[PDB]
Design an enzyme around this catalytic site. Structure first.
Site, PDB file in Angstrom:
ATOM      1  NE  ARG A 157      -3.485   2.325   2.797  1.00 13.79           N
ATOM      2  CZ  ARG A 157      -3.541   3.106   3.874  1.00 13.79           C
ATOM      3  NH1 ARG A 157      -2.827   2.857   4.964  1.00 13.79           N
ATOM      4  NH2 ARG A 157      -4.342   4.165   3.852  1.00 13.79           N
ATOM      5  CG  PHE A 161      -0.420   9.207   3.334  1.00 17.89           C
ATOM      6  CD1 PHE A 161       0.063   9.604   4.577  1.00 17.89           C
ATOM      7  CD2 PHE A 161      -1.460   8.284   3.297  1.00 17.89           C
ATOM      8  CE1 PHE A 161      -0.447   9.059   5.749  1.00 17.89           C
ATOM      9  CE2 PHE A 161      -1.979   7.746   4.471  1.00 17.89           C
ATOM     10  CZ  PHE A 161      -1.471   8.136   5.695  1.00 17.89           C
ATOM     11  CD  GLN A 180       0.021   0.061   5.697  1.00 17.32           C
ATOM     12  OE1 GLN A 180      -0.551   1.130   5.524  1.00 17.32           O
ATOM     13  NE2 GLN A 180      -0.572  -0.984   6.270  1.00 17.32           N
ATOM     14  CG  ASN A 200      -2.683   1.428  14.581  1.00 21.19           C
ATOM     15  OD1 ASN A 200      -3.789   1.743  14.136  1.00 21.19           O
ATOM     16  ND2 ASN A 200      -1.882   2.293  15.200  1.00 21.19           N
ATOM     17  CG  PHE A 221       3.186   4.278   7.956  1.00 20.93           C
ATOM     18  CD1 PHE A 221       2.526   3.662   9.014  1.00 20.93           C
ATOM     19  CD2 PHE A 221       3.294   5.660   7.964  1.00 20.93           C
ATOM     20  CE1 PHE A 221       2.008   4.409  10.060  1.00 20.93           C
ATOM     21  CE2 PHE A 221       2.776   6.410   9.014  1.00 20.93           C
ATOM     22  CZ  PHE A 221       2.133   5.774  10.063  1.00 20.93           C
ATOM     23  CG  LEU A 252      -1.134   9.371  10.702  1.00 26.63           C
ATOM     24  CD1 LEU A 252      -0.226   8.550   9.812  1.00 26.63           C
ATOM     25  CD2 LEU A 252      -2.525   8.750  10.767  1.00 26.63           C
ATOM     26  CG  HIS A 267      -0.528   5.224  13.231  1.00 22.28           C
ATOM     27  ND1 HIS A 267      -0.722   3.989  12.648  1.00 22.28           N
ATOM     28  CD2 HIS A 267      -1.667   5.926  13.022  1.00 22.28           C
ATOM     29  CE1 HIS A 267      -1.921   3.961  12.087  1.00 22.28           C
ATOM     30  NE2 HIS A 267      -2.518   5.118  12.309  1.00 22.28           N
TER      31      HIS A 267
HETATM   32  C1  LIG Z   1      -7.444   1.012   2.877  1.00 23.68           C
HETATM   33  C2  LIG Z   1      -6.397   0.146   3.378  1.00 23.68           C
HETATM   34  N1  LIG Z   1      -5.903   0.246   4.694  1.00 23.68           N
HETATM   35  N2  LIG Z   1      -5.033  -0.581   4.893  1.00 23.68           N
HETATM   36  C3  LIG Z   1      -4.328  -0.710   6.167  1.00 23.68           C
HETATM   37  C4  LIG Z   1      -3.864  -1.950   6.664  1.00 23.68           C
HETATM   38  C5  LIG Z   1      -3.194  -1.991   7.904  1.00 23.68           C
HETATM   39  C6  LIG Z   1      -2.986  -0.805   8.635  1.00 23.68           C
HETATM   40  C7  LIG Z   1      -3.459   0.421   8.121  1.00 23.68           C
HETATM   41  S1  LIG Z   1      -3.259   1.904   8.940  1.00 23.68           S
HETATM   42  N3  LIG Z   1      -4.628   2.156  10.033  1.00 23.68           N
HETATM   43  O1  LIG Z   1      -3.221   3.025   7.921  1.00 23.68           O
HETATM   44  O2  LIG Z   1      -1.963   1.884   9.712  1.00 23.68           O
HETATM   45  C8  LIG Z   1      -4.128   0.475   6.890  1.00 23.68           C
HETATM   46  C9  LIG Z   1      -4.779  -1.415   3.682  1.00 23.68           C
HETATM   47  O3  LIG Z   1      -3.962  -2.308   3.586  1.00 23.68           O
HETATM   48  C10 LIG Z   1      -5.733  -0.908   2.616  1.00 23.68           C
END
Ligand SMILES: CC1=NN(c2cccc(S(N)(=O)=O)c2)C(=O)C1
Length: 164
Positions: free
Chosen positions: A54, A59, A62, A101, A112, A121, A125
């Site tokens: 991702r 931004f 990840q 998370n 990330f 964040l 995070h």
């Molecule tokens: C939309 C998506 N959000 N995520 C995702 C998966 C694990 C943690 C996080 S996060 N809450 O941004 O750290 C996002 C994806 O993988 C696709």
């Protein structure tokens, strides 16, 4: 001192180079240790061979889902998930290394690298390091992202480990 670790990253099977990360074990020892050990693979699992799944331009990039390769998986060296250690370090700018998370106290292995200041964040995070070398590689990874997070090249951590 604080650990230095590395990720060697391919895009579509050709090397982009190395990202070197300092882990702030002085501030977040448990979170740093998890990432360090997942880089070396010393517990029998970790980041080697896994992907940046991702990536969103302007931004963050990840990675770390080495079980499901899609954002749903990963595990820590302690168990499946572990608590938010603290929120002392802030998302100050490009190069910040922080835990992904699914809400409070759901750290596993996903992480990330920010390509901008992501202040919203802060307090949500756990920041645990930053890029020492290889922001050029991070910018390449970033350039293969999209608004949806879908990558346009397959971005693979081919090798990783500890430098000191
Ligand atoms: C939309 C998506 N959000 N995520 C995702 C998966 C694990 C943690 C996080 S996060 N809450 O941004 O750290 C996002 C994806 O993988 C696709």
């Amino acid at each position: 001192g604080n650990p230095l670790v590395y990720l060697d990253v391919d895009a579509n099977g050709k090397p982009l180079g190395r990202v070197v990360l300092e882990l702030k074990a002085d501030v977040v020892p448990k979170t740093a240790e998890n990432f360090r050990a997942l880089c070396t693979g010393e517990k029998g699992f970790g980041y080697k061979g896994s992907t940046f799944h991702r990536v969103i331009p302007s931004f963050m990039c990840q990675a770390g889902d080495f079980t499901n390769h899609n954002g749903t998986g990963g595990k820590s060296i302690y168990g499946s998930r572990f608590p938010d250690e603290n929120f002392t370090l802030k998302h100050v700018g490009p190069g910040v290394l922080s835990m992904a998370n699914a809400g409070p106290n759901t750290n596993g292995s996903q992480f990330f690298i920010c390509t901008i200041k992501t202040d919203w964040l802060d307090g949500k995070h756990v920041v645990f390091g930053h890029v020492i070398e290889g922001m050029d590689v991070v910018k390449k990874i970033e350039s293969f992202g999209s608004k949806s997070g879908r990558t346009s090249k397959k971005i693979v951590i081919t090798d990783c480990g500890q430098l000191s």
